Amino acid sequence: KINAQNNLPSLKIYEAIGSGNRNFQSGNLCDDDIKAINYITGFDSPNAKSYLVVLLNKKNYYIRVPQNQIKFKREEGDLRNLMNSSVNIIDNLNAHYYTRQSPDVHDYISYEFTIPGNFNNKDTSNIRLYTSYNQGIGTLFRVTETIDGYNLINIQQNLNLLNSTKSIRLLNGAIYILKVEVTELNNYNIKLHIDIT
Amino acid sequence: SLNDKIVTISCKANTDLFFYQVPGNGNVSLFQQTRNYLERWRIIYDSNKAAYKIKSMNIYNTNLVLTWNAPTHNISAQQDSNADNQYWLLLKDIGNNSFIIASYKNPNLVLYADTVARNLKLSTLNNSSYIKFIIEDYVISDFKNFTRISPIGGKVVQQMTNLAVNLYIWNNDLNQKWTIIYNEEKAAYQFFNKILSVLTWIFDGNTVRVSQNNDAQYWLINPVNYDRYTITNLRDKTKVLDLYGGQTADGTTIQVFNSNGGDNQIWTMSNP
Amino acid sequence: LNDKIVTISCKANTDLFFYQVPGNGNVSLFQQTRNYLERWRIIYDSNKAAYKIKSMNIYNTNLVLTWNAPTHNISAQQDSNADNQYWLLLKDIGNNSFIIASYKNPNLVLYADTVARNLKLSTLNNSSYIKFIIEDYVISDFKNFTCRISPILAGGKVVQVSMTNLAVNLYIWNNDLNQKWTIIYEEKAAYQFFNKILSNGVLTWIFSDGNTVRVSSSAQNNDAQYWLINPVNYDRYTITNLRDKVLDLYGGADGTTIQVFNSNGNQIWTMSNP
Amino acid sequence: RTFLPNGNYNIKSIFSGSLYLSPVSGSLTFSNESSANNQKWNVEYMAENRCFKISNVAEPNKYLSYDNFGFISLDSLYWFPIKIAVNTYIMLSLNKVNELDYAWDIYDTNENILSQPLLLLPNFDIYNSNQMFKLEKI
């Protein structure tokens, strides 16, 4: 997991194509001077908090920062379920919609959102999630954070988000992560709609 | 005084749910009243632990004791290795005579009936009714309220104004319907006939007929296979209701008294 | 056990009984006595499906066992039917004994602090310090009691004559082994009145004659060795033979024969320490 | 520094918002607001064993711990928080008591935790409403 201070600078990670196939020194970076980059994940939006959760190989990776510090952690827990996706952190939520760059087909985006209200494990809210133009398979995780990292409890699977009408009862105050796997690329942006009732 | 007894464990939250060992797999569930070997458990007790173990009388898997699984809170019943997690303190709430079953391995947790998932769990002690249970002898459980005595095959004893004992083939008639109820004051059963508002006898020979504050109208059912039962009268305690001469005729007047373990003296009790 | 007088004693140290310290309002564990302070009246509330353990103290009778506050300590306080003054009595059937849990918090059960000789609370666990023995008070007072029996208006007189004549009568109190007795309890639910001096001797009713009692003993099928004690004060008792559902004492004075004179209906005795 | 930062907190139950953790007579209960220093708790993350130490600010050199009777008390001689919602944790035990995770537990009658000690009881999942505690930073 790669992030920045307060997650504010949204970084974009690339993999150097054909790196690690040549000279290597154990424990040290071997600059291959390869400028052919294969995009992995990231957002170009300047003011949009997001952190990257990417699988990396013992290969050269570039991290692009737009116009502070960069923190790398080696997640080994349930966060592995968010492989190769940027986690757009939603904080303005309080019929909200968030428009981000649409990932390619079979590539993942993730939205981490906190249901408004006070948590008491009894009060819920009917939350409906749906895209606007791009069909994608949805997945929902409940988030529980310990000192060792983050734990994700699977909630649903195989959700058709393209103009979906199904609603799900989610506890107020709890944190959820929606992992969308874009299956149909009918637009350049994905506009995910979170509607609260 | 429940050492080595065959019981059923009803749920105090819903008196129509029973400990039911699902045939096939080993899961225990809260099923409706099925008066057979699946809802029947033995309470053989360990003197060196002051705790009980709850064996099951599933015929095709004899050694199957109630078990608490792992640090999970499930109660699947498996083979008896006499492990610590397989014993259960049987505390009795003196008021209302319900029970609390607390795991011997960790007696901070007690049996909890979901009644929404129809299975059991381990909860912490509450003031609710989902941790109370009713353990009782199966003969009491399956006959405290029941509604067809069939001599050992397809013919059933019956009774409007001709009140007596007969034997005609099953007809789903109102004269061929017997409802058994139990009185835990004389500790005795009665067989009402579901045609009017109790058999009295042993007070001109047999003269078994349906009619009082008389001990004649009281019977004790004692199992003999466990699915066949003998019926003794609470007048002499040695008179057993039987058939006449072991005749399988469809007019036979069933009689009473004596014993000798004759096949005419046993009965396969009602089956709805 | 609604409205029933009992005595709670610990299963670990069986000689320690619940005791309400007079004057002060706390409850501790003390040695076996036979006064009212160790007696508790258990009452059942069916709406609560719970129990109130009244203290049988004669000075302030409206005292119940109470778990004060989140604090561990337990004390006898004036009752108010508060949730913290109600208890759940669970009998362990495989090991005859009681576990007393709190209605306020059933996760917490009474605990016998033996070093402190007090009562605490503890989470339910399989230890002997949480199991107790609740049983009728006249059974506990007399299940094994070396004592002296005396009539009313005859305080300096003990019902007990010598090793030579196995018959007995009233005698003067002189602290002799022929004066003291030992009362034993369970199968027959009655007590035998062994005599201290007369080894293996029991107080027998010879019903050959009408009104006579002696010390004959050694009768398995006896029906007269055993006697039943029934309270009438709570320390004055009457004894009845287990054949008619009774020691009496004629109007006459040292030397008077005791005998089973009349049926139920004098004839009131008290048993106390030697 | 993002998950339970070191500092000072008020501990409440999800059952009530006006009751704060107060150490009365060697047992911890939830009592009304007192605007005092006994209702605040210093949380420090000890990394030598990766655990959390809560102390009473009004009475330092005392640490929250569990005694043999199942209560929770303040000693002078190990906790594992896990977060399930915004400012909401279930305090677990770094030591597996009887090979099973134990956690803080408070009992309630129809959601009323007044005059109820804080106990340590077995934990199975994150769905027990009785074991939920809000650690509001102060």
Q: What is the DSSP secondary-structure string of C63-109?
A: EEEEE-SSSS-EEEEE----GGG-EEEEEETTTTEEEEEESS-TTEE
Contacts of B126 in chain C (CB under 8 A): 106
Contacts 24+ apart (CB under 8 A), A151-158: A151/A77, A151/A78, A151/D82, A152/A78, A152/A79, A152/A81, A152/A82, A152/A177, A153/D126, A154/A81
Spatial distance between the Cα atoms of C32 and C14, rounded to a whole number of angstroms:
9
Q: Do B93 and C88 touch (CB under 8 A)?
A: yes
Spatial distance between the Cα atoms of D84 and D73, rounded to a whole number of angstroms:
24
Q: Residue A182 — φ and ψ, nearest 5°?
A: -65, 120
Closest partner residue to A174 (CB to CB) among D3, D82, D85 is: D85
Q: Do A119 and D81 touch (CB under 8 A)?
A: no
Q: Do A112 and A98 form a contact (C-beta atoms < 8 A)?
A: no
Spatial distance between the Cα atoms of A77 and A16, rounded to a whole number of angstroms:
26
Spatial distance between the Cα atoms of B62 and B79, rounded to a whole number of angstroms:
9
Contacts of C1 in chain B (CB under 8 A): 94
Distance of CA A86 to the CA centre of its chain: 3
Closest partner residue to C124 (CB to CB) among B52, B125, B126 is: B125
Q: Which residues of chain D form beta strands (DSSP E)? A: 7-13, 20-24, 27-31, 41-46, 51-56, 63-66, 72-75, 79-85, 88-93, 102-105, 119-122, 133-137
What residues of chain D have any CB closer than 8 angstroms to a CB in chain A? 3-4, 14-15, 45, 50, 52, 80-88, 126-127, 129, 132
Nearest C-alpha in D relative to C108: D70
Q: Which of B132, C104, A118 is nearest to D108 (CA)?
A: C104
Q: Do C72 and D28 touch (CB under 8 A)?
A: no
Q: What one-character DSSP code corresponds to residue D97?
A: B
Closest partner residue to D100 (CB to CB) among B106, B124, B127 is: B106
Amino acid residing at C165: N
Task: Quickly count: other Cβ atoms within 10 Å of residue A157's Cβ.
Answer: 9
Spatial distance between the Cα atoms of B185 and B183, rounded to a whole number of angstroms:
5
Task: Quickly count: other Cβ atoms within 10 Å of residue B190's Cβ.
Answer: 16
| A and C adjacent (3 or more CB pairs under 8 angstroms) | no
Contacts of D126 in chain B (CB under 8 A): none
- Measured CA to CA in angstroms, residue C155 lies from B263, C254, D23 at distances of 70, 12, 57
Q: Which residues of C107-253 form beta strands (DSSP E)? A: 108-113, 118-123, 132-136, 144-151, 157-159, 170-172, 181-184, 191-195, 203-205, 213-215, 226-231, 237-241
Q: Do A158 and A73 form a contact (C-beta atoms < 8 A)?
A: no
Cβ within 8 Å of residue A69, ≥6 positions away: A4, A5
Q: What angle is formed at CA C165 by the lines to CA C159 and CA C170, rounded to 5 degrees? A: 20
Closest partner residue to C121 (CB to CB) among D24, D69, D105 is: D69
- Measured CA to CA in angstroms, residue B92 lies from B132, B184, C29, C93, C247 at distances of 9, 19, 25, 7, 40
Spatial distance between the Cα atoms of D59 and D69, rounded to a whole number of angstroms:
23
Q: Which chain D residues in 56-85 lie under 8 Å from chain C, judged by CB atoms? A: 69-71
Residue B256 is encoded by which pair of tokens?
Answer: 């009473």
Residue C139 belongs to what H/E stretch?
helix C137-142
Structure solved using which method? cryo-EM
- Measured CA to CA in angstroms, residue C55 lies from C19, C21, C30, C45, C79 at distances of 9, 11, 15, 16, 10
Q: Which of D81, D32, D80, D40 is nearest to D58 (CA)?
A: D40
In Å, what resolution does this model reach?
Answer: 2.8
- Mind telling me how many Å the CA of B238 is from chain C's nearest CA? 27
- Mind telling me how many Å the CA of D108 is from chain C's nearest CA? 8
- Measured CA to CA in angstroms, residue A85 lies from A3, A148, B153 at distances of 13, 21, 72
Helices (H), B56-215: 138-141
| B and C adjacent (3 or more CB pairs under 8 angstroms) | yes
3-class secondary structure, A70: strand
Q: Do D61 and D70 form a contact (C-beta atoms < 8 A)?
A: no
- Mind telling me how many Å the CA of D111 is from chain A's nearest CA? 11
Q: Residue B207 — φ and ψ, nearest 5°?
A: 40, 55
Q: What angle is formed at CA C83 by the lines to CA C79 and CA C88, rounded to 5 degrees? A: 100
Q: Residue C85 — φ and ψ, nearest 5°?
A: -105, 10
Would an 8 Å CB–CB cutoff place D109 in contact with chain B? yes
Q: Do C252 and C157 form a contact (C-beta atoms < 8 A)?
A: no
Amino acid residing at A59: K
| Partners of chain A (3+ Cβ pairs below 8 A) | D
- Taking one residue from A and the other from D, the number of pairs with CB-CB distance under 8 angstroms is 46
Write the burial class of residue C209 (CB in 10 Å: 0-12 exposed, 13-18 middle, 19+ buried). Answer: exposed
Nearest C-alpha in B relative to C98: B91
Closest partner residue to C107 (CB to CB) among D26, D109, D121 is: D121
Q: Do B71 and D121 touch (CB under 8 A)?
A: no
Task: Quickly count: other Cβ atoms within 10 Å of residue C127's Cβ.
Answer: 12
Q: Do C88 and B90 touch (CB under 8 A)?
A: no
Closest partner residue to B95 (CB to CB) among C44, C93, C124 is: C44
Q: Do D50 and A174 touch (CB under 8 A)?
A: no
Closest partner residue to B107 (CB to CB) among C89, C106, C126 is: C126
Q: Which residues of B149-228 form beta strands (DSSP E)? A: 155-156, 168-169, 178-183, 188-193, 199-200, 209-210, 219-223
Closest partner residue to B100 (CB to CB) among C1, C90, C123 is: C90
Residue A12 is encoded by which pair of tokens?
Answer: 């974009």
Would an 8 Å CB–CB cutoff place B84 in contact with chain C? no
Spatial distance between the Cα atoms of C73 and C113, rounded to a whole number of angstroms:
11
| Partners of chain C (3+ Cβ pairs below 8 A) | B, D
Half-sphere exposure of residue C45: CA atoms within 13 angstroms, side-chain side: 15
Q: Do A146 and D14 touch (CB under 8 A)?
A: no
3-class secondary structure, A125: strand
- Measured CA to CA in angstroms, residue D90 lies from A122, A147, B168, C89, D122 at distances of 16, 13, 68, 32, 12
